[PDB]
């Protein structure tokens, strides 16, 4: 009774909240039930009470992310009374729905499409599941459908749509979806439909990446975790089925009077299976030691990956061209775990993990910076350096140092607050007094006055190479600690070198050759040969005064590919672009669209076109463009960006 109460309360509610809020709601309900002396089993997971092993395996085959939030979302999607409204900014939910309902020929549609109504009627006539990708522009014809305003006349189950009557089929089901995660719906909407929130949060991506690396790495121990699942699903299953077989074989009751009770052998088999399951529960206690170890070893990796992806997400603020989808970061992850040449000759788990995290940081930077302005590469490198600094255990947080390094200018001074040190300018004096507020830099004025090598160093061409040891500390600092201290010294002292010195800082954290790939010319051959999907367009966004046509034309020439290049200036250009794309999607040739920034709306329509299209393996759509905010955000998110 209590179990079903909690499970139903979680199914009906909690369909819109994130993982933490769902957990808090479940905890509050459980605490109240305990207060009321209602017995509910605590050991079970809500994701397991409402789900079966076979349906879970089908979901896994249907590319359901291993996230617990996504598991609960799938459970809510299977069992419902009001038609779901899927809020998936990531886009995984649409793929999962189509894979799950492919056998039932699910049809995609959008509200903006005029044929939608007709398709709806077909979905009402043949009882086929239907998906709508855009419901922000609601058309209220579903109000009778959502309310289930059925009429049972004769043998007919009938509904009123507009001024027409359409017969219902029980096999019919509709699935509303929104890509926008921040849209607000009117109260009637949140009453008619249940919500299935698919937004990726910090804990969500942490768990998803943890499970991904658990499956990919330690494949033998991945099979050990699978065996953890088996003992619940096979050893327990074998135990119970052998119990029922014993019961049936004894239920035969053959040979009356005669001693046919040879069921004792099956009793021994029952005891063997029961002891096997109990010892496998003890092995799950070992899992609280061993599989917990396999999880906690990769926990820093998943934490750093969640931090990386949300750093990419918040990178959208500093420029309108820095739009990275979750699928791009998942492709980065898959290229790190799989198809990684650096893992071919390494078998030890610890070395594989360290190499994987290093390749993660390196490939993430090398993929992001390719579509990122040269003045900002150091910023993203510094962000990744801070992420890895947080990842490292022995190294201190350096929270105060970075806080000062970012917010020194906000500290208010006075004319008397500057002692006017000889050899130091007024602004340099302000920087000195502001930086002296820190404890490790308290004696900075004394060192400044006492030192004599200061005069040469301050006016040196490259002071950052030979920053003197001014700051006084009780214990020796880490090399990265020395790097951040010297970074603060450079910022206060010679801010012009700051940028350059920042490079050294990242070289102290992420290796000397971290940005070393940025300096070579962009090797387009391997970029387009692999690691980019034929569906995904290659965006070449160049600042005004530069054309990227030559690089990719040479790319096509050297690979012996007949490329069709079309400029986008008029409706005839639109027709030629569409014809070329329709030829090349099946033939396999490469296609090129120049100056697509001239037509933003047509760019949106083109993005919608590539969304529902499976092209040939050799298909490559290049879009050469100018960097202006008129370019649609969806095309930027749905394509690989090159600057």
């Amino acid at each position: 009774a209590g179990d079903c109460l909690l499970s139903a309360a979680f199914i009906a509610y909690a369909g819109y909240f994130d993982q933490q809020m769902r957990q808090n709601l479940f905890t509050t309900w459980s605490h109240h039930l305990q207060q009321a002396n209602i017995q509910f089993r605590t050991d079970i997971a809500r994701t397991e009470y409402l789900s079966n092993a076979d349906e879970r395996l089908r979901w896994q085959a249907s590319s359901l992310p291993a996230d617990d939030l996504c598991t609960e979302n799938a459970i809510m999607l299977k069992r419902f009374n009001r038609y779901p409204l899927i809020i998936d900014p990531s886009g995984q939910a649409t793929e999962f729905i189509m894979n799950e309902y492919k056998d039932r020929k699910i049809t995609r549609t959008s509200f903006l499409d005029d044929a939608f109504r007709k398709n709806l009627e077909s979905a009402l006539r043949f009882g086929n599941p239907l998906l709508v990708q855009d419901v922000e522009s609601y058309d209220p014809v579903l109000n009778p459908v959502l309310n289930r305003e059925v009429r049972r006349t004769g043998g007919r189950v009938l509904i009123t749509l507009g001024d027409q009557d359409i017969d219902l089929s029980p096999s019919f089901v509709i699935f509303l979806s929104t890509r926008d995660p921040t849209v607000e719906f009117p109260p009637d909407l949140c009453s008619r439909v249940t919500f299935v929130n698919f937004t990726v949060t910090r804990s969500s991506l942490q768990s998803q990446c943890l499970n991904e690396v658990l499956k990919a790495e330690r494949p033998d121990v991945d099979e050990k975790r699978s065996d953890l699942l088996k003992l619940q699903g096979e050893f327990q299953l074998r135990l119970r089925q052998l119990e029922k077989s014993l019961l049936q074989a004894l239920n035969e009751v053959k040979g009356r009077i005669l001693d046919d009770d040879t069921i004792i052998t099956t009793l021994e088999n029952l005891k063997r299976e029961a002891a096997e399951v109990t010892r496998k529960v003890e092995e799950t206690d070992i899992v609280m030691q061993e599989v917990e170890t396999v999880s906690q070893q990769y926990l820093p990796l998943s934490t750093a990956c969640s931090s990386i992806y949300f750093t990419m997400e918040s990178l959208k603020q500093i420029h309108f061209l820095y739009q990275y989808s979750l699928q791009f970061f998942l492709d980065i992850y898959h290229n790190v775990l799989y198809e990684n040449p650096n893992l071919k000759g390494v078998t030890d788990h610890t070395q594989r993990l360290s190499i994987i995290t290093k390749d993660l940081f390196q490939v993430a930077f090398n993929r992001v910076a390719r579509g990122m302005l040269h003045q900002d590469h150091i910023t993203f490198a510094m962000l990744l350096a801070r992420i890895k600094l947080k990842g490292t255990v022995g190294e201190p947080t350096y929270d105060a140092e970075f806080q000062h390094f970012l917010r020194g200018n906000e500290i208010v001074l006075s004319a008397g607050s500057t002692p006017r040190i000889q050899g130091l300018t007024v602004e340099q004096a302000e920087a000195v007094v502001r930086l002296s507020c820190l404890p490790a830099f308290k004696d900075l004025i004394a060192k400044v006055q006492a030192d004599e090598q200061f005069g040469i160093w301050l006016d040196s061409s490259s002071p950052e190479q030979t920053v003197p040891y001014l700051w006084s500390e009780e214990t020796p600092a880490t090399p990265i600690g020395q790097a951040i201290h010297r970074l603060l010294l450079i910022q206060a002292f010679r801010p012009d070198r700051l940028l350059a010195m920042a490079h050294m800082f990242v070289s102290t954290n992420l290796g000397e050759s971290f940005m070393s790939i940025m300096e070579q010319p962009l090797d387009l051959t391997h970029i387009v040969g692999t690691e980019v999907k034929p569906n995904t367009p290659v965006l070449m966004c160049s600042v005004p005064g530069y054309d990227a046509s030559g690089h990719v034309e040479d790319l096509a020439a050297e690979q012996n590919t007949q490329i069709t290049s079309i400029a986008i200036g008029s409706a005839e250009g639109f027709n030629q672009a569409d014809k070329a794309i329709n030829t090349a999607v099946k033939s396999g040739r490469w296609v090129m669209l120049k100056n697509v920034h001239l037509a933003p709306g047509w760019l949106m329509q083109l993005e919608k076109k590539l969304h529902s299209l499976q092209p040939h393996a050799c298909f490559r759509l290049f879009l050469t463009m100018e960097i202006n905010p008129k370019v649609p955000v969806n095309l930027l998110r749905a394509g690989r960006i090159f600057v």
Partner: protein, 72 residues
């Protein structure tokens, strides 16, 4: 407890509104759907577990029939 669950959902929505995050109205239709889902889950879990409980109960006196045979 069901009433408390509805009130707790209302309180959580109000707290999220106070914190400035997006909140979504919890109508009494949500309560109706919750009660219907409680009915469905309780009925299905009972129709499985109590059905096999009937099987187990028949087996419980099957052992007594075997005891009768042993006494014979």
């Amino acid at each position: 407890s069901c009433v408390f669950v509805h009130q707790t959902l209302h309180q959580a929505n109000a707290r999220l509104a106070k914190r400035g995050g997006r909140t979504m109205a919890i109508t009494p239709r949500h309560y109706l759907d919750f009660i219907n889902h409680y009915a469905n889950l309780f009925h299905e879990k009972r129709s499985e577990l109590e059905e096999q409980q009937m099987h187990l109960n028949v087996g419980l006196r099957k052992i007594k029939e075997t005891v009768d045979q042993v006494e014979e």
